[PDB]
Every structure is written in C-alpha cells, then in structure tokens.
Design a protein around this motif. Structure first.
Motif, PDB file in Angstrom:
ATOM      1  N   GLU A 125       0.828  -1.203   0.000  1.00  0.00           N
ATOM      2  CA  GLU A 125       0.000   0.000   0.000  1.00  0.00           C
ATOM      3  C   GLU A 125       0.864   1.255   0.000  1.00  0.00           C
ATOM      4  O   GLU A 125       0.525   2.250  -0.653  1.00  0.00           O
ATOM      5  N   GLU A 126       1.996   1.212   0.706  1.00  0.00           N
ATOM      6  CA  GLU A 126       2.895   2.362   0.747  1.00  0.00           C
ATOM      7  C   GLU A 126       3.578   2.582  -0.597  1.00  0.00           C
ATOM      8  O   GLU A 126       3.721   3.729  -1.046  1.00  0.00           O
ATOM      9  N   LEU A 127       4.002   1.499  -1.257  1.00  0.00           N
ATOM     10  CA  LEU A 127       4.591   1.632  -2.589  1.00  0.00           C
ATOM     11  C   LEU A 127       3.574   2.153  -3.596  1.00  0.00           C
ATOM     12  O   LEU A 127       3.921   2.946  -4.482  1.00  0.00           O
ATOM     13  N   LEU A 128       2.316   1.707  -3.488  1.00  0.00           N
ATOM     14  CA  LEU A 128       1.269   2.269  -4.342  1.00  0.00           C
ATOM     15  C   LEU A 128       1.179   3.780  -4.177  1.00  0.00           C
ATOM     16  O   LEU A 128       1.040   4.518  -5.163  1.00  0.00           O
ATOM     17  N   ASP A 129       1.265   4.259  -2.936  1.00  0.00           N
ATOM     18  CA  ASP A 129       1.232   5.698  -2.696  1.00  0.00           C
ATOM     19  C   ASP A 129       2.464   6.376  -3.276  1.00  0.00           C
ATOM     20  O   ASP A 129       2.366   7.462  -3.865  1.00  0.00           O
ATOM     21  N   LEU A 130       3.634   5.746  -3.128  1.00  0.00           N
ATOM     22  CA  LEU A 130       4.849   6.328  -3.684  1.00  0.00           C
ATOM     23  C   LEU A 130       4.770   6.410  -5.200  1.00  0.00           C
ATOM     24  O   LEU A 130       5.191   7.411  -5.799  1.00  0.00           O
ATOM     25  N   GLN A 131       4.237   5.365  -5.836  1.00  0.00           N
ATOM     26  CA  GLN A 131       4.116   5.349  -7.291  1.00  0.00           C
ATOM     27  C   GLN A 131       3.152   6.425  -7.777  1.00  0.00           C
ATOM     28  O   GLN A 131       3.446   7.169  -8.723  1.00  0.00           O
ATOM     29  N   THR A 132       1.984   6.508  -7.145  1.00  0.00           N
ATOM     30  CA  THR A 132       0.959   7.440  -7.596  1.00  0.00           C
ATOM     31  C   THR A 132       1.332   8.884  -7.272  1.00  0.00           C
ATOM     32  O   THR A 132       1.061   9.789  -8.066  1.00  0.00           O
ATOM     33  N   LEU A 133       1.933   9.124  -6.105  1.00  0.00           N
ATOM     34  CA  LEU A 133       2.308  10.494  -5.763  1.00  0.00           C
ATOM     35  C   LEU A 133       3.428  11.007  -6.660  1.00  0.00           C
ATOM     36  O   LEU A 133       3.443  12.196  -6.999  1.00  0.00           O
ATOM     37  N   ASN A 134       4.369  10.141  -7.061  1.00  0.00           N
ATOM     38  CA  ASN A 134       5.350  10.561  -8.059  1.00  0.00           C
ATOM     39  C   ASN A 134       4.657  10.985  -9.348  1.00  0.00           C
ATOM     40  O   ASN A 134       5.003  12.018  -9.937  1.00  0.00           O
ATOM     41  N   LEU A 135       3.639  10.229  -9.770  1.00  0.00           N
ATOM     42  CA  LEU A 135       2.849  10.597 -10.943  1.00  0.00           C
ATOM     43  C   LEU A 135       2.138  11.933 -10.752  1.00  0.00           C
ATOM     44  O   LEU A 135       2.157  12.795 -11.640  1.00  0.00           O
TER      45      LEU A 135
END
Length: 477
Positions: A125-135
């Motif tokens: 879930e944290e990596l999903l946030d990192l991926q989407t927030l970079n986007l």
C-alpha cells in the motif's frame, strides 16, 4: 502611445533517451515534461489573449510521437505502472531514488511523501502511494481540475486510480503536437525548431572559433570535418518541421543560443530569415550593444538578442518569490526599459520552457496566470509572435558585420569543451566520425552529452554517459 514590444520564446527540448539496442527510454524526463509542460505551456493561450512563441527540437518531437503512439518503452514509467507485488528490488530502489532527487521541489510537497521517505520498509500500500504520488507530482495545469479528487486525497491510492491517472496523462501527450498546430493556425504564436539533435553548430563548422572567447583553452585535434553534419542537422530539422506543420521553418532557435559568423551564414543559406541569441554575445560583438533593436547580420538575416536579466529572472530567480511580488518586479523592469528609450523597444524573453516550473509554488501556475493576466491589461505592452517581431516596421534597427562566437553561458563554449573529461567525449566523437555509417553520429553530436560529461554529482550522469557511448557505437556498425 509608444509601446514596448514583448516577445516570449519558450524553448522545449530533450536529448534522445532511447537506448538504440534495447529500444528502452532510460530516463523518464520526456514523459514527465510532456504531461506537465509541453501541452500545458501553449495551452495557456486558451485562457489568455496574448502572443506566446515556442521552439520544439525535432528530437523532442520524435520522442513525443513515440509516447503518444504507446510505443515508448520507458523503464522508470514501468516501475510506476506495475503492481508493487511485481516490483523488482532494482525498480523499488530507482523509485526511492527518483523521489529523493525531487523531494525538495514544491511540486513534491505531499505530506504522505514525507511519511514514506521516513519508513524503513514499504509494504504494497505504501509503494502504491509512492508510485501514484510521483505521478501526481507532475500533474499539469489542465489536469489539476479533472484530478483534483485524487490530489486532495493525498494517500491510500489504489492500482485502479494510478491507471486512471496514467490514462489521462497519455491523453495529454496524444493532444500535444495538435495544440502547437492550432496556436500556429490561429495566429496566437509562432513555432520554431532547432537543428535536429540540438548540437553546437559553431563548433561543428569551425572548432577554432572557441579561441575567439577562450584563447588559452585546450581542445582536441579535430582531424575530421563536421561541416557537412552541421548542414544535415539544419536540413533534417526543416524536413521534420515540414512533416509536422506542413511549412518550411523561417525561424530557428540556435541551440544554447550559439552563433558564429559561419553558423549565421549556414542558417541564412538554409533559408532561415530570423533567429535569436544572447546579449552576452551582443556585448562581446558590438560596442554600443542595445538588446532592444532588430539587428541585420550582414543585411542578410535578422537577429534579436534576448534580454538576459529578464529571461534569467523567470528561469532562475522568481521560483523563490511570491507570485505577486515577482510579477510586480517584472512589470516594473519593463516600465524602466519603456521609459529609458525614445523608440519602441523589442524585448525578447527566451529560456527553457519546461525546466523552471517544478521549483515554483504550484508548478508556476500562480506566477504565469498572474503574469499573463497583468501583461494583458498594460496598454503600453504589446506581445508579438516571432513573425510579427520579424516584420514590425516601427522598431529601431542596426546592421552588424560580425559576432564573437559563443553561447548563452558566459558567451563561450567552456560548458561543453576545454577540460579533460569533456575533451575526451569530443575525442571519442572525432574517432567515431572517421568510420561513421549512419545518422546515429548526428545523435551523438547533441549538446547535452557534453554538458553532463564531467559533472560527477549531476543526476544520472552514468545514464547520459551510457546513452552517448551507445549512440557512438551504434553509429559505426
């Protein structure tokens, strides 16, 4: 009423990130500046009735087309797209390091990012946030409305939502070349191009010209001629421009503002009628060097010199100001110019069009909206297209007979040649030219490779080194 003529010329460029053997885009900068800047900078013209001009290098155009067609294999973007369960340990590391590099920029001000950079390990879930927030950190002005829900959410992103953002982003890329055709069609701005791979035309034509400004410099022995390649960069750019817009370009931005007596002659012989360069070169070349005139180089090609301090204020200074104060400062300096001369001055504001905004609060949108709306209201300012600047009759003009060769970095070539590491790239280039077989030798003559060579803490220098050497090798085989 006596007016000040104001000419914005926003320069858009990326070197070729596409590795020639794997076909992979080794850095994602073209994707990110496409979704954030390349569509949205000309899209300001939808809301503001001013003139704004743009330069697109052909190598940038090539990459935009490949992304728009869904063919670009972007290795970093793959790390963002994947479900975190499928991330390689190497892809996790690249994501973390991309975040760290961009962490202090205002476009990355999400408190969730600060939380994620402070955790020892990241779950799915944290990596999903990192991926989407970079986007989302790279969201352009247009999409900030359609995506407001996701931007205000700030955390707990799902794979579904990330894929939605990616869909909309590619929609923006697919619409990008069309908005440049439109503003050119509607007369709201001129669009120029550069020699194809953004090389240093004066050095390709005559490397000895570096001695005009740095007489004590040491450069390699240019035992092979590049004069023909310089012609080809210009000729292929004209053909590329003719493919996108159906017309031959009459305006060109010389890469790094670089000009010389021989380069101006080449531009003239290829049918270019006007270009711009930098007022350091003007100060080096003519005694009474006002940058507010239209110049005629040997009565054969028109030349404007950009106002360096106004260009640099936007490009390097105003990110650190409040928008209201920055615009007031800018308009105040224009007023001073306006009152300082008895003619109608032409003020060229020329800089990279995509690189400064990520350092501004809200990606420069408060500044630019305030700037553009304020320029709109000043009766004594008229913004011009490049065509209008080139042909305007009520301006002051002067003939110039010669220039000192240089660039807009201190009026010399030391950012790309003259030290051991940079000279070694040129040595490699020279040896590769002797047995070059194809146009990848033109790719390797781009200015970007020589800029990054030697800078040991500059970001991803090993990637630029890999790309340059791959193109050099590919050019011979």
């Amino acid at each position: 009423m006596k007016k000040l003529f104001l000419v914005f010329w926003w320069h858009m460029h990326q070197p070729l990130y596409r590795e020639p053997y794997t076909g992979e885009y080794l850095l994602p900068w073209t994707f990110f500046h496409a979704v954030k800047d390349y569509y949205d900078m000309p899209a300001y013209l939808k809301d503001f009735e001013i003139k704004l001009n743009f330069n697109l290098t052909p190598v940038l155009i090539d990459q935009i087309q490949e992304y728009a067609q869904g063919k670009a294999k972007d290795v970093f973007l793959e790390a963002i797209r994947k479900d975190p369960d499928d991330l390689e340990k190497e892809e996790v590391e690249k994501l973390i390091e991309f975040t760290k590099l961009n962490y202090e920029k205002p476009i990355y001000r999400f408190e969730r990012i600060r939380e994620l950079m402070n955790k020892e390990k990241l779950n799915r879930e944290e990596l999903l946030d990192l991926q989407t927030l970079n986007l989302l950190a790279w969201c352009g002005r247009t999409l900030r409305k359609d995506l407001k829900d996701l931007l205000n959410k700030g955390r707990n992103y799902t794979q579904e939502e990330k894929e939605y953002v990616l869909n909309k982003y590619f929609e923006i890329i697919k619409k990008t070349l069309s908005i440049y055709r439109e503003i050119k069609e509607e007369g709201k701005g001129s669009v120029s191009t550069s020699p194809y791979y953004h090389p240093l035309i004066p050095i390709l034509l005559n490397p000895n010209c570096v001695y005009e400004t740095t007489p004590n410099v040491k450069i390699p022995d240019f035992a092979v001629s590049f004069r023909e390649d310089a012609s080809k960069h210009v000729e292929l750019a004209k053909e590329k421009y003719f493919e996108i817009f159906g017309e031959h370009p009459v305006y060109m931005w010389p890469p790094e503002a670089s000009v010389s007596n021989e380069a101006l002659e080449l531009y003239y012989e290829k049918g270019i009628n006007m270009l711009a360069t930098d007022e350091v070169i003007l100060k080096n070349s003519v005694e009474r060097a006002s940058p507010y005139l239209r110049y005629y180089f040997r009565e054969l090609i028109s030349v404007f010199f950009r106002d360096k301090t106004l260009s640099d204020l936007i490009g390097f200074s105003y990110h650190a100001w409040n928008a209201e104060d920055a615009v007031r400062d800018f308009i105040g300096r224009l007023k001073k110019i306006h009152e300082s001369v008895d003619f109608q001055p032409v003020v060229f504001v020329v800089l990279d069009g995509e690189n400064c905004w990520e350092y501004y609060e809200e990606n420069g949108i408060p500044f630019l909206e305030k700037l553009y709306s304020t320029l709109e209201k000043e009766e004594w300012i008229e913004t011009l297209t490049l065509e209008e600047a080139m042909r305007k009759e009520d301006v002051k003009t002067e003939v110039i007979e010669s220039v000192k060769a240089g660039t807009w970095f201190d009026g010399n070539f030391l950012k790309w040649i003259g030290n051991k590491e940079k000279n070694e790239y040129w040595k490699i280039l020279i040896e590769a030219k002797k047995k070059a077989k194809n146009d990848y030798i033109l790719v390797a003559e781009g200015s970007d490779w020589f800029w990054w060579q030697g800078e040991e803490k500059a970001p991803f220098v090993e990637v630029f080194d890999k790309l340059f050497r791959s193109f050099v090798r590919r050019a011979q085989e």
